[PDB]
Design a protein around this ligand. Structure first.
Ligand SMILES: [K+]
Ligand SMILES: [Mg+2]
Ligand SMILES: [Mg+2]
Ligand SMILES: [Mg+2]
Ligand SMILES: [Mg+2]
Ligand SMILES: [Mg+2]
Ligand SMILES: [Mg+2]
Ligand SMILES: [Mg+2]
Ligand SMILES: [Mg+2]
Ligand SMILES: [Mg+2]
Ligand SMILES: [Mg+2]
Ligand SMILES: [Mg+2]
Ligand SMILES: [Mg+2]
Ligand SMILES: [Mg+2]
Ligand SMILES: [Mg+2]
Ligand SMILES: [Mg+2]
Ligand SMILES: [Mg+2]
Ligand SMILES: [Mg+2]
Ligand SMILES: [Mg+2]
Ligand SMILES: [Mg+2]
Ligand SMILES: [Mg+2]
Ligand SMILES: [Mg+2]
Ligand SMILES: [Mg+2]
Ligand SMILES: [Mg+2]
Ligand SMILES: [Mg+2]
Ligand SMILES: [Mg+2]
Ligand SMILES: [Mg+2]
Ligand SMILES: [Mg+2]
Ligand SMILES: [Mg+2]
Ligand SMILES: [Mg+2]
Ligand SMILES: [Mg+2]
Ligand SMILES: [Mg+2]
Ligand SMILES: [Mg+2]
Ligand SMILES: [Mg+2]
Ligand SMILES: [Mg+2]
Ligand SMILES: [Mg+2]
Ligand SMILES: [Mg+2]
Ligand SMILES: [Mg+2]
Ligand SMILES: [Mg+2]
Ligand SMILES: [Mg+2]
Ligand SMILES: [Mg+2]
Ligand SMILES: [Mg+2]
Ligand SMILES: [Mg+2]
Ligand SMILES: [Mg+2]
Ligand SMILES: [Mg+2]
Ligand SMILES: [Mg+2]
Ligand SMILES: [Mg+2]
Ligand SMILES: [Mg+2]
Ligand SMILES: [Mg+2]
Ligand SMILES: [Mg+2]
Ligand SMILES: [Mg+2]
Ligand SMILES: [Mg+2]
Ligand SMILES: [Mg+2]
Ligand SMILES: [Mg+2]
Ligand SMILES: [Mg+2]
Ligand SMILES: [Mg+2]
Ligand SMILES: [Mg+2]
Ligand SMILES: [Mg+2]
Ligand SMILES: [Mg+2]
Ligand SMILES: [Mg+2]
Ligand SMILES: [Mg+2]
Ligand SMILES: [Mg+2]
Ligand SMILES: [Mg+2]
Ligand SMILES: [Mg+2]
Ligand SMILES: [Mg+2]
Ligand SMILES: [Mg+2]
Ligand SMILES: [Mg+2]
Ligand SMILES: [Mg+2]
Ligand SMILES: [Mg+2]
Ligand SMILES: [Mg+2]
Ligand SMILES: [Mg+2]
Ligand SMILES: [Mg+2]
Ligand SMILES: [Mg+2]
Ligand SMILES: [Mg+2]
Ligand SMILES: [Mg+2]
Ligand SMILES: [Mg+2]
Ligand SMILES: [Mg+2]
Ligand SMILES: [Mg+2]
Ligand SMILES: [Mg+2]
Ligand SMILES: [Mg+2]
Ligand SMILES: [Mg+2]
Ligand SMILES: [Mg+2]
Ligand SMILES: [Mg+2]
Ligand SMILES: [Mg+2]
Ligand SMILES: [Mg+2]
Ligand SMILES: [Mg+2]
Ligand SMILES: [Mg+2]
Ligand SMILES: [Mg+2]
Ligand SMILES: [Mg+2]
Ligand SMILES: [Mg+2]
Ligand SMILES: [Mg+2]
Ligand SMILES: [Mg+2]
Ligand SMILES: [Mg+2]
Ligand SMILES: [Mg+2]
Ligand SMILES: [Mg+2]
Ligand SMILES: [Mg+2]
Ligand SMILES: [Mg+2]
Ligand SMILES: [Mg+2]
Ligand SMILES: [Mg+2]
Ligand SMILES: [Mg+2]
Ligand SMILES: [Mg+2]
Ligand SMILES: [Mg+2]
Ligand SMILES: [Mg+2]
Ligand SMILES: [Mg+2]
Ligand SMILES: [Mg+2]
Ligand SMILES: [Mg+2]
Ligand SMILES: [Mg+2]
Ligand SMILES: [Mg+2]
Ligand SMILES: [Mg+2]
Ligand SMILES: [Mg+2]
Ligand SMILES: [Mg+2]
Ligand SMILES: [Mg+2]
Ligand SMILES: [Mg+2]
Ligand SMILES: [Mg+2]
Ligand SMILES: [Mg+2]
Ligand SMILES: [Mg+2]
Ligand SMILES: [Mg+2]
Ligand SMILES: [Mg+2]
Ligand SMILES: [Mg+2]
Ligand SMILES: [Mg+2]
Ligand SMILES: [Mg+2]
Ligand SMILES: [Mg+2]
Ligand SMILES: [Mg+2]
Ligand SMILES: [Mg+2]
Ligand SMILES: [Mg+2]
Ligand SMILES: [Mg+2]
Ligand SMILES: [Mg+2]
Ligand SMILES: [Mg+2]
Ligand SMILES: [Mg+2]
Ligand SMILES: [Mg+2]
Ligand SMILES: [Mg+2]
Ligand SMILES: [Mg+2]
Ligand SMILES: [Mg+2]
Ligand SMILES: [Mg+2]
Ligand SMILES: [Mg+2]
Ligand SMILES: [Mg+2]
Ligand SMILES: [Mg+2]
Ligand SMILES: [Mg+2]
Ligand SMILES: [Mg+2]
Ligand SMILES: [Mg+2]
Ligand SMILES: [Mg+2]
Ligand SMILES: [Mg+2]
Ligand SMILES: [Mg+2]
Ligand SMILES: [Mg+2]
Ligand SMILES: [Mg+2]
Ligand SMILES: [Mg+2]
Ligand SMILES: [Mg+2]
Ligand SMILES: [Mg+2]
Ligand SMILES: [Mg+2]
Ligand SMILES: [Mg+2]
Ligand SMILES: [Mg+2]
Ligand SMILES: [Mg+2]
Ligand SMILES: [Mg+2]
Ligand SMILES: [Mg+2]
Ligand SMILES: [Mg+2]
Ligand SMILES: [Mg+2]
Ligand SMILES: [Mg+2]
Ligand SMILES: [Mg+2]
Ligand SMILES: [Mg+2]
Ligand SMILES: [Mg+2]
Ligand SMILES: [Mg+2]
Ligand SMILES: [Mg+2]
Ligand SMILES: [Mg+2]
Ligand SMILES: [Mg+2]
Ligand SMILES: [Mg+2]
Ligand SMILES: [Mg+2]
Ligand SMILES: [Mg+2]
Ligand SMILES: [Mg+2]
Ligand SMILES: [Mg+2]
Ligand SMILES: [Mg+2]
Ligand SMILES: [Mg+2]
Ligand SMILES: [Mg+2]
Ligand SMILES: [Mg+2]
Ligand SMILES: [Mg+2]
Ligand SMILES: [Mg+2]
Ligand SMILES: [Mg+2]
Ligand SMILES: [Mg+2]
Ligand SMILES: [Mg+2]
Ligand SMILES: [Mg+2]
Ligand SMILES: [Mg+2]
Ligand SMILES: [Mg+2]
Ligand SMILES: [Mg+2]
Ligand SMILES: [Mg+2]
Ligand SMILES: [Mg+2]
Ligand SMILES: [Mg+2]
Ligand SMILES: [Mg+2]
Ligand SMILES: [Mg+2]
Ligand SMILES: [Mg+2]
Ligand SMILES: [Mg+2]
Ligand SMILES: [Mg+2]
Ligand SMILES: [Mg+2]
Ligand SMILES: [Mg+2]
Ligand SMILES: [Mg+2]
Ligand SMILES: [Mg+2]
Ligand SMILES: [Mg+2]
Ligand SMILES: [Mg+2]
Ligand SMILES: [Mg+2]
Ligand SMILES: [Mg+2]
Ligand SMILES: [Mg+2]
Ligand SMILES: [Mg+2]
Ligand SMILES: [Mg+2]
Ligand SMILES: [Mg+2]
Ligand SMILES: [Mg+2]
Ligand SMILES: [Mg+2]
Ligand SMILES: [Mg+2]
Ligand SMILES: [Mg+2]
Ligand SMILES: [Mg+2]
Ligand SMILES: [Mg+2]
Ligand SMILES: [Mg+2]
Ligand SMILES: [Mg+2]
Ligand SMILES: [Mg+2]
Ligand SMILES: [Mg+2]
Ligand SMILES: [Mg+2]
Ligand SMILES: [Mg+2]
Ligand SMILES: [Mg+2]
Ligand SMILES: [Mg+2]
Ligand SMILES: [Mg+2]
Ligand SMILES: [Mg+2]
Ligand SMILES: [Mg+2]
Ligand SMILES: [Mg+2]
Ligand SMILES: [Mg+2]
Ligand SMILES: [Mg+2]
Ligand SMILES: [Mg+2]
Ligand SMILES: [Mg+2]
Ligand SMILES: [Mg+2]
Ligand SMILES: [Mg+2]
Ligand SMILES: [Mg+2]
Ligand SMILES: [Mg+2]
Ligand SMILES: [Mg+2]
Ligand SMILES: [Mg+2]
Ligand SMILES: [Mg+2]
Ligand SMILES: [Mg+2]
Ligand SMILES: [Mg+2]
Ligand SMILES: [Mg+2]
Ligand SMILES: [Mg+2]
Ligand SMILES: [Mg+2]
Ligand SMILES: [Mg+2]
Ligand SMILES: [Mg+2]
Ligand SMILES: [Mg+2]
Ligand SMILES: [Mg+2]
Ligand SMILES: [Mg+2]
Ligand SMILES: [Mg+2]
Ligand SMILES: [Mg+2]
Ligand SMILES: [Mg+2]
Ligand SMILES: [Mg+2]
Ligand SMILES: [Mg+2]
Ligand SMILES: [Mg+2]
Ligand SMILES: [Mg+2]
Ligand SMILES: [Mg+2]
Ligand SMILES: [Mg+2]
Ligand SMILES: [Mg+2]
Ligand SMILES: [Mg+2]
Ligand SMILES: [Mg+2]
Ligand SMILES: [Mg+2]
Ligand SMILES: [Mg+2]
Ligand SMILES: [Mg+2]
Ligand SMILES: [Mg+2]
Ligand SMILES: [Mg+2]
Ligand SMILES: [Mg+2]
Ligand SMILES: [Mg+2]
Ligand SMILES: [Mg+2]
Lengths: 7, 48, 275
RNA sequence: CGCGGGGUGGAGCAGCCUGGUAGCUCGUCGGGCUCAUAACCCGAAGGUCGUCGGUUCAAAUCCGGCCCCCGCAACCA
RNA sequence: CCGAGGGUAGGGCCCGUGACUGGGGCGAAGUCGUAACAAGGUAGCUGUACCGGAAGGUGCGGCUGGAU
RNA sequence: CGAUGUCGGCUCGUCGCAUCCUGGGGCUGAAGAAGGUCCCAAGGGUUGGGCUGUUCGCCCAUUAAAGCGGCACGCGAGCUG
RNA sequence: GAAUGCCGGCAUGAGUAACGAUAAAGAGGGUGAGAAUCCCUCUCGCCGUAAGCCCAAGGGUUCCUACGCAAUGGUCGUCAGCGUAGGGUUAGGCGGGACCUAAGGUGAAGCCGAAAGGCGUAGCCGAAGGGCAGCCGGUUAAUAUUCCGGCCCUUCCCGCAGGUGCGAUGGGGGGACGCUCUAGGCUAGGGGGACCGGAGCCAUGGACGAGCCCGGCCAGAAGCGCAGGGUGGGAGGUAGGCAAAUCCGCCUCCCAACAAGCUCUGCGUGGUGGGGAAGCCCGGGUGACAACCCCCCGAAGCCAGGGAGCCAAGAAAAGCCUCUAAGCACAACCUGCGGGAACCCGUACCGCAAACCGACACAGGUGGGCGGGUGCAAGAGCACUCAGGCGCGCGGGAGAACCCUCGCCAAGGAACUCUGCAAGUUGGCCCCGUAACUUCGGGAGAAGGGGUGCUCCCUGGGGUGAUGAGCCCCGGGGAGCCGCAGUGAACAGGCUCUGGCGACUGUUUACCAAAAACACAGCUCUCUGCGAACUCGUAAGAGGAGGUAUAGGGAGCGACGCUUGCCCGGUGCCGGAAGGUCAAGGGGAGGGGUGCAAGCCCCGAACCGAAGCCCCGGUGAACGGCGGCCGUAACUAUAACGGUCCUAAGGUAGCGAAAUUCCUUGUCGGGUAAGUUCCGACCUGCACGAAAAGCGUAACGACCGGAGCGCUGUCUCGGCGAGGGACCCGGUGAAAUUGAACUGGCCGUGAAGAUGCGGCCUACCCGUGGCAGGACGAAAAGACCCCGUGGAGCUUUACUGCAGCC
RNA sequence: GAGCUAGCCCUGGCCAGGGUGAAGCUGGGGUGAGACCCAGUGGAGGCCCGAACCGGUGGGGGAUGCAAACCCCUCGGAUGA
RNA sequence: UGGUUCGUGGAGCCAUGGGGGAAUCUGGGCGGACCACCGCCUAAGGCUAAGUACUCCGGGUGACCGAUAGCGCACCAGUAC
């Protein structure tokens, strides 16, 4: 599961 | 699915066997170490 | 006379095959074949040392007579011309009046039923082997030994030849298939005529699978790789070379000369190759 | 008030660095050649150097402010 | 059953029209050069080919409808 | 920063009023009809589509009207991606 | 007392989720302390190219039987792959070894390496490849090609007889080979029979019948028959097959040659030996003296080392046959016959799975053979069924929301949405018919349409047989009948127009990317004369290649079409016996230390002195790069034209708001009621452009864009219905999380978002089914960001080394 | 450690059925001879449709799973690299 | 080049991969570049107890542990897994 990206 | 362990008696004996170990400087050190540690089995069991 | 096909598949549109017209015997001489051990380009370490090799059709090696000074003076009849998968040339089966049989590379124009002979006194006819000194200047020749008694080394591929340009001392001057001008010792044997099957170079493989049949695995460009792999590897998007074009091992590959400088054979090479 | 370069006869460019000197090509003006125009030949005129202020005995030139004209940058989110 | 015709679908020919585009004709006094007519100042013309703001230039071969 | 998931949409609402409509008004350069402007008023209502991820906006067809803002740019242990 | 500390114990969540494919169960009888769950019987359902049967791996007693049920079994348990005990695996012919060799491994000779060790021809090892002698039936609770029975066969030893120049690890032959297609004749297997054998049956309206139902074979030596495979015979010469050779090879001659002859298989027959159903009665008995026969279909199997065609050109060695050498010809070998001899290991059971690989009795993974019948054009597809095997090791009710999988839907028909995502539609076969474009193959199943069942009658060809009948395979014509509907169920394309990209079939990030990426034929440059270049290795030795410039390495580009312009000043590479610089070394002008001196010792200029660098040239499908300002035409505008500065040279053709355009939804045109997307144009191209190729291109694509038709529950806009869950009762019973808790709302306050502080409001105690706003809810010591004189991968004209090369 | 995975080497095995109909061959036409055209025969192909087998396109489910990558529907290849 | 305290240092000594290459006591090496003087020692063959190190094994002894300690193991442990 791709981690959430706060980028 | 296809897992990694796919047993094969001939493969086992020719790869980890007593005679494979003895043929080689590192393999003899394996035997030397497992004797010093007191292993009941110096080499993997395979029925042949 | 390379053969074409009608475009009934996308690959048959371009494929061409050799016409096999000169061939007169479709199975080899059992006593003259032996197994050709395929390598896949791997050396005695098991390491790939020539990339992209393997997986081609199984072949039997045909023993070829590259000496012919072996049987001086003994004539032979040309029994057949056969396909050989181990080389581009066709090959000729010889029946010596001895009863001995042998294969040679089939020169252009050689005819089934004619005779051939080797030696210092042989006539100057297509298919005959003489020492180089006894062959007249101007003669087109193939299967040339490069040193006496060491075996034919030069001009062996389909269609090739050398031409005798002149003499000097114990040596004759040859123009090799590459155009190089070279001194070859006069006692070196050579065979009169050019190698045959000269249409070989016009075959169009036509499809990727054909290269696979020949044992040629796909070749991948350095520019398609990563910096771990290759000087041309990496870059965002496509990328030019960005440095002098190089091999996988980093040496330059556009012009950089590679013949060893102090090689003894330089005293015997008159003029480097042409075109 | 992110960064850089530029402004000097009519046009396009030197001179600045290294203070005291304004230069080159074309254009323009007078004359000549030709029936005549152009080309060509012989002469000449025209720039106080974007502006202000300072330094200096002296500023196109060195330093600062302003005006204008280009060019570059603006990423991680 | 055939059957005017209606419907569905796919073709053929012709006309009109279309952002834009190609060249053509014509138009008293526009800009550039001067290719041709004199050996027109490199004889011209010519089929082809390549090139050039433009007429044109050059290569190859051909013609005299070229002069001296 | 030993983690407060970050745009838009969908769903579901709820609130403020600087009010888009409907209701009540004063002034008008309000004849009538229709407007303009300001005051009171938040009870209810405030459409369907083309384009774009879009918020917004432009356009089509309507409408009494096609309001503007807050709720972690409301709402991912509710969905979407 | 804290370290997301360590080890152990025990809580919470909670009687909660779950109990592992939605193939499915019901009853009667029995056993037992106890039974939905074990046994038996009837009924029902599921698989049936398997979910049945047989091998090989792997597993290792799980096999069979008696006794058991604490634990294991997701419930239960009397049952079990579980516990205890006893029993069980039988070979000259099956498989492997006392036979052969393959890759590869090992390795006398030999080569190399500080040591360890690395190589290496022969030879040896190495098999699911070669070679080699057993078929059918019976028997056990459990093994059987193994025991037994019947009929066959192999090697070794010895002997007798006959024959022969006998004799080998040496010579030779043979063994011995691909892919696709395929002939004849057979077998396996299957269908039908009004014929043969059989316990019986007549029901509920009819049938005592050419009725129904069941079965109608298997193995076999010599001999014979059919069909195939393999093979020329004789003589003369002979210098080749590393000795010899009567063999083999070559040459010559004569004969035999779509033959024959000899030889070897397959199939049939065959003395004989077996088997033998339904049904009924109790695995057995009976049937039964069972019958065992005709017709058809027919292999991918057999004859086989068969035939043809093609290019990519298709193992070895032994067995075997032949030749001869030492030798020996009292021997020896060949043939026949007789007697004797014949060892070791495996054999149980599971084996697409509860016994193997996945921690589990796990919806996953696991190679080879058999795999029946009917219909559907065919088939291993699909539906139903045989043999055989199962109902998936928790159940009983209920008939809420909600979820999953499924069915239908009025009117509308993409209005849904990023997107027709999803789901409809279409759907097989036969006939009719079919566009642009095109590389002439194709595009094409283009599109679009018609037919499709059953009955009677006439009739065509092919196979079998006989040339007939019967059987069998493809049809053709006419007349009818029925329904809403005839590929009536199941399996089975939605279509079109138009752009971008990539020519194409292929390949890829095992497990978030399948693509426009990689590869690809093809094009070009460049290196390489062979002990090649290049690659791996300290080396020896290998690969390259048993190849040789039409070949091999490296690099870019990427079918094909039309093309690929200008710059060589910088970097690269290539060429250049001059010159400049240049290390060790040579040289030794000239000094110095010390010694009484002979001397010993040290420093040292000119000059000679490689590669490299400088220098001079060449070179672009080498790295790369391809301009600015100002002015000018008789309307305006715009500039073909001119001026000047600069450059190594100033972007040619083609293309262009683009997979590239910032301003931008550029502007105009098309399509739409309306179009930031799309398509066609324009060109002030922020920032295309010619092998990091430019512009096109038929065909191709689970790629990405835009449109239309068809059709729809996508939507207006939801409704109903099915089953598996959810819910209730009986059985078994987790989890992350958790400082403790007696845990409300508002308005404030507080480290700035309060159940916990203030003030006020509200509120009896405790659950069950639900929803997710909050507990800055769980999970993971933020993967973004910074910081650390932290780490790692990668680059280069950063530094400094090293290999390698000069 | 290559019993997973990647490549190569050796030796074996597997790919139902249907469709399209290249070359060649034969014959006919054609010509001075030809090229060539027509028909029949033929059975080619990184050809077509589709099981096994090999894949993993789109969606849904699953997410303390049946499963540390599975299931359903759909979809690619299927004589070949 | 290594060794030594000696990292090129005035760098000797001891060892030696490369080149060159003697002499037999009036021969040769050393005393930290080198020279003289003065001294020390006899290279290019080999052997040699004891005093020294260790603890698999045996014993003796602890202001050593006392079953989460002490060895990983007090127990059928280098076992189960
Ligand atoms: K970042
Ligand atoms: Mg795998
Ligand atoms: Mg698999
Ligand atoms: Mg395996
Ligand atoms: Mg094995
Ligand atoms: Mg095995
Ligand atoms: Mg193995
Ligand atoms: Mg090994
Ligand atoms: Mg071994
Ligand atoms: Mg050792
Ligand atoms: Mg033991
Ligand atoms: Mg071991
Ligand atoms: Mg072709
Ligand atoms: Mg063609
Ligand atoms: Mg040929
Ligand atoms: Mg051989
Ligand atoms: Mg080797
Ligand atoms: Mg290579
Ligand atoms: Mg290779
Ligand atoms: Mg070759
Ligand atoms: Mg050949
Ligand atoms: Mg020579
Ligand atoms: Mg080629
Ligand atoms: Mg090949
Ligand atoms: Mg290639
Ligand atoms: Mg490539
Ligand atoms: Mg790359
Ligand atoms: Mg890459
Ligand atoms: Mg690597
Ligand atoms: Mg690199
Ligand atoms: Mg690069
Ligand atoms: Mg790249
Ligand atoms: Mg780029
Ligand atoms: Mg890349
Ligand atoms: Mg690019
Ligand atoms: Mg490039
Ligand atoms: Mg570059
Ligand atoms: Mg380079
Ligand atoms: Mg030589
Ligand atoms: Mg050369
Ligand atoms: Mg400031
Ligand atoms: Mg200056
Ligand atoms: Mg000055
Ligand atoms: Mg001036
Ligand atoms: Mg001045
Ligand atoms: Mg930046
Ligand atoms: Mg009508
Ligand atoms: Mg002219
Ligand atoms: Mg003129
Ligand atoms: Mg002129
Ligand atoms: Mg002229
Ligand atoms: Mg010119
Ligand atoms: Mg934070
Ligand atoms: Mg935490
Ligand atoms: Mg957290
Ligand atoms: Mg919606
Ligand atoms: Mg209101
Ligand atoms: Mg919008
Ligand atoms: Mg916003
Ligand atoms: Mg907007
Ligand atoms: Mg109104
Ligand atoms: Mg708002
Ligand atoms: Mg905000
Ligand atoms: Mg914001
Ligand atoms: Mg939100
Ligand atoms: Mg979410
Ligand atoms: Mg959201
Ligand atoms: Mg949340
Ligand atoms: Mg929530
Ligand atoms: Mg939350
Ligand atoms: Mg504390
Ligand atoms: Mg914890
Ligand atoms: Mg800790
Ligand atoms: Mg702990
Ligand atoms: Mg305990
Ligand atoms: Mg614990
Ligand atoms: Mg506990
Ligand atoms: Mg408690
Ligand atoms: Mg509890
Ligand atoms: Mg709960
Ligand atoms: Mg659960
Ligand atoms: Mg569960
Ligand atoms: Mg299922
Ligand atoms: Mg029951
Ligand atoms: Mg029970
Ligand atoms: Mg019970
Ligand atoms: Mg039972
Ligand atoms: Mg019953
Ligand atoms: Mg096991
Ligand atoms: Mg029990
Ligand atoms: Mg007990
Ligand atoms: Mg249990
Ligand atoms: Mg279980
Ligand atoms: Mg009991
Ligand atoms: Mg048993
Ligand atoms: Mg037996
Ligand atoms: Mg024996
Ligand atoms: Mg070694
Ligand atoms: Mg072995
Ligand atoms: Mg074998
Ligand atoms: Mg056997
Ligand atoms: Mg038998
Ligand atoms: Mg039997
Ligand atoms: Mg052969
Ligand atoms: Mg062979
Ligand atoms: Mg074989
Ligand atoms: Mg082939
Ligand atoms: Mg039979
Ligand atoms: Mg049948
Ligand atoms: Mg002879
Ligand atoms: Mg001779
Ligand atoms: Mg046979
Ligand atoms: Mg019986
Ligand atoms: Mg009886
Ligand atoms: Mg088969
Ligand atoms: Mg066969
Ligand atoms: Mg061999
Ligand atoms: Mg005798
Ligand atoms: Mg005999
Ligand atoms: Mg024995
Ligand atoms: Mg045994
Ligand atoms: Mg057995
Ligand atoms: Mg399976
Ligand atoms: Mg199987
Ligand atoms: Mg089982
Ligand atoms: Mg595991
Ligand atoms: Mg189970
Ligand atoms: Mg399973
Ligand atoms: Mg049957
Ligand atoms: Mg069918
Ligand atoms: Mg069940
Ligand atoms: Mg099942
Ligand atoms: Mg209920
Ligand atoms: Mg289901
Ligand atoms: Mg249903
Ligand atoms: Mg209905
Ligand atoms: Mg409806
Ligand atoms: Mg519609
Ligand atoms: Mg409609
Ligand atoms: Mg999408
Ligand atoms: Mg259908
Ligand atoms: Mg069309
Ligand atoms: Mg057409
Ligand atoms: Mg079209
Ligand atoms: Mg087209
Ligand atoms: Mg066509
Ligand atoms: Mg009909
Ligand atoms: Mg009917
Ligand atoms: Mg289809
Ligand atoms: Mg592609
Ligand atoms: Mg691609
Ligand atoms: Mg392309
Ligand atoms: Mg293309
Ligand atoms: Mg394919
Ligand atoms: Mg992936
Ligand atoms: Mg990945
Ligand atoms: Mg992974
Ligand atoms: Mg993983
Ligand atoms: Mg995926
Ligand atoms: Mg991708
Ligand atoms: Mg794909
Ligand atoms: Mg890729
Ligand atoms: Mg391609
Ligand atoms: Mg070494
Ligand atoms: Mg090789
Ligand atoms: Mg070789
Ligand atoms: Mg190309
Ligand atoms: Mg490519
Ligand atoms: Mg391509
Ligand atoms: Mg074209
Ligand atoms: Mg250059
Ligand atoms: Mg140059
Ligand atoms: Mg250059
Ligand atoms: Mg030099
Ligand atoms: Mg550059
Ligand atoms: Mg440059
Ligand atoms: Mg140009
Ligand atoms: Mg051009
Ligand atoms: Mg544009
Ligand atoms: Mg536009
Ligand atoms: Mg474009
Ligand atoms: Mg651009
Ligand atoms: Mg734009
Ligand atoms: Mg934009
Ligand atoms: Mg617009
Ligand atoms: Mg429009
Ligand atoms: Mg524009
Ligand atoms: Mg195209
Ligand atoms: Mg196309
Ligand atoms: Mg594709
Ligand atoms: Mg695709
Ligand atoms: Mg559409
Ligand atoms: Mg719905
Ligand atoms: Mg229900
Ligand atoms: Mg109750
Ligand atoms: Mg309970
Ligand atoms: Mg339990
Ligand atoms: Mg408390
Ligand atoms: Mg409390
Ligand atoms: Mg509470
Ligand atoms: Mg409360
Ligand atoms: Mg504060
Ligand atoms: Mg605050
Ligand atoms: Mg508060
Ligand atoms: Mg409270
Ligand atoms: Mg408190
Ligand atoms: Mg309190
Ligand atoms: Mg307080
Ligand atoms: Mg309080
Ligand atoms: Mg309070
Ligand atoms: Mg309250
Ligand atoms: Mg509750
Ligand atoms: Mg409850
Ligand atoms: Mg609840
Ligand atoms: Mg909540
Ligand atoms: Mg919350
Ligand atoms: Mg928190
Ligand atoms: Mg929260
Ligand atoms: Mg996580
Ligand atoms: Mg940490
Ligand atoms: Mg942190
Ligand atoms: Mg972290
Ligand atoms: Mg930061
Ligand atoms: Mg630092
Ligand atoms: Mg620091
Ligand atoms: Mg650091
Ligand atoms: Mg690092
Ligand atoms: Mg090199
Ligand atoms: Mg493997
Ligand atoms: Mg293996
Ligand atoms: Mg296939
Ligand atoms: Mg045909
Ligand atoms: Mg033909
Ligand atoms: Mg033929
Ligand atoms: Mg295909
Ligand atoms: Mg098809
Ligand atoms: Mg779907
Ligand atoms: Mg998962
Ligand atoms: Mg699945
Ligand atoms: Mg499916
Ligand atoms: Mg197929
Ligand atoms: Mg297919
Ligand atoms: Mg094939
Ligand atoms: Mg030292
Ligand atoms: Mg020293
Ligand atoms: Mg030395
Ligand atoms: Mg002395
Ligand atoms: Mg002396
Ligand atoms: Mg000494
Ligand atoms: Mg001393
Ligand atoms: Mg001394
Ligand atoms: Mg001494
Ligand atoms: Mg002593
Ligand atoms: Mg004590
Ligand atoms: Mg104590
Ligand atoms: Mg204890
Ligand atoms: Mg303790
Ligand atoms: Mg101990
Ligand atoms: Mg312990
Ligand atoms: Mg312990
Ligand atoms: Mg134990």
């Amino acid at each position: 599961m791709t981690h959430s990206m706060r980028c | 699915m296809k897992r990694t362990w796919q047993p094969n008696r001939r493969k086992r004996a020719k790869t980890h066997g007593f005679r494979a170990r003895m043929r080689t400087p590192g393999g003899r050190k394996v035997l030397k170490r497992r004797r010093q540690k007191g292993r009941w089995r110096l080499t993997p069991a395979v029925r042949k | 006379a390379v053969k074409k096909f009608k475009p009934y598949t996308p690959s048959r549109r371009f494929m061409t095959v050799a016409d096999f017209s000169e061939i007169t015997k479709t199975e080899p001489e059992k006593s003259l074949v032996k197994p050709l051990k395929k390598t896949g380009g791997r050396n005695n370490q098991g390491r790939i040392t020539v990339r992209f090799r393997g997986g081609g059709h199984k072949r039997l090696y045909r023993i070829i007579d590259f000496k012919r000074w072996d049987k001086v003076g003994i004539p032979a009849k040309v029994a057949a011309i056969e396909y050989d998968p181990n080389r581009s040339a066709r090959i000729a089966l010889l029946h010596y009046v001895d009863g001995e049989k042998r294969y040679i590379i089939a020169p252009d124009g050689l005819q089934v039923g004619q005779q051939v002979v080797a030696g210092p006194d042989a006539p100057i006819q297509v298919g005959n082997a003489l020492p180089l000194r006894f062959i007249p200047v101007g003669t087109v020749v193939h299967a040339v030994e490069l040193e006496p008694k060491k075996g034919a080394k030069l001009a062996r591929a389909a269609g090739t030849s050398a031409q005798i340009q002149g003499r000097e001392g114990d040596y004759v001057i040859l123009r090799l298939p590459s155009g190089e001008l070279r001194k070859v010792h006069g006692e070196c044997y050579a065979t009169v005529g050019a190698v045959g099957n000269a249409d070989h170079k016009n075959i169009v493989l036509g499809k990727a699978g054909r290269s696979r049949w020949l044992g040629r695995r796909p070749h991948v460009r350095g520019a398609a790789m990563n910096p771990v792999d290759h000087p041309h590897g990496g870059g965002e998007g496509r990328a030019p070379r960005g440095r002098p074009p190089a091999s996988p091992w980093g040496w330059q590959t556009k012009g950089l000369k590679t013949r060893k400088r102090r090689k003894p054979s330089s005293r015997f090479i008159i003029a480097r190759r042409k075109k």
